[PDB]
C-alpha cells in the first residue's frame, strides 16, 4: 500500500485546513488508517484514527473537539479536518495505515505498516 497527502502550507490561527490522503486503489487496501504528526527533531506522534469501516475513531488529548477523521473507502481516501487551527498545530502530518487484515483504530506507530511522505502545515498570527 502508497499512501499520498494533500492539503497544507501556511494557514492562519484561528481558522481551519481539510488534509486528505490518498491510499491503494488497487489490489492491496489499508485497515486501520491515522494521522501523526511531527513537531521538529521529535517523534511522529499520534494525532487521529480511524478503524477500517470508519466506525471508531479516536484522537490525541488536544486535538479532540476539533479535529475529525473520516474515510471513504469507495474512493480509497481518508481526511483530517482541523478546526480552530493554533500554533502547536505546526508540525509534518503524516498519513498512515495497517495492513487490511488489521482493521482497529491505529493508534501506535507500531501498528502502522504503510506511511505518506507527509506534508508541512505551519499555522501563523
Ligand atoms: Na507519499
Known amino acids: 500500500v502508497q499512501l499520498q497527502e494533500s492539503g497544507g502550507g501556511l494557514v492562519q490561527a484561528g481558522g481551519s485546513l481539510r488534509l486528505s490522503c490518498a491510499a491503494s486503489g488497487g489490489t492491496f487496501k489499508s485497515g486501520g488508517m491515522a494521522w501523526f504528526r511531527q513537531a521538529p527533531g521529535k517523534a511522529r506522534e499520534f494525532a487521529a484514527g480511524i478503524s477500517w469501516s470508519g466506525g471508531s475513531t479516536d484522537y490525541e488529548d488536544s486535538v479532540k473537539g476539533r479535529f475529525t477523521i473520516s474515510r471513504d473507502n469507495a474512493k480509497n481516501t481518508m481526511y483530517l479536518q482541523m478546526n480552530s487551527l493554533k500554533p502547536e498545530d505546526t508540525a509534518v502530518y503524516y498519513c498512515?495505515?495497517?495492513?487490511?487484515?488489521?482493521?482497529?483504530?491505529?493508534?501506535?506507530?507500531?501498528?502502522?505498516?504503510?506511511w505518506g511522505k507527509g506534508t508541512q502545515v505551519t499555522v501563523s498570527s
Open positions: 498512515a495505515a495497517a495492513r487490511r487484515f488489521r482493521a482497529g483504530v491505529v493508534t501506535r506507530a507500531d501498528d502502522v505498516d504503510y
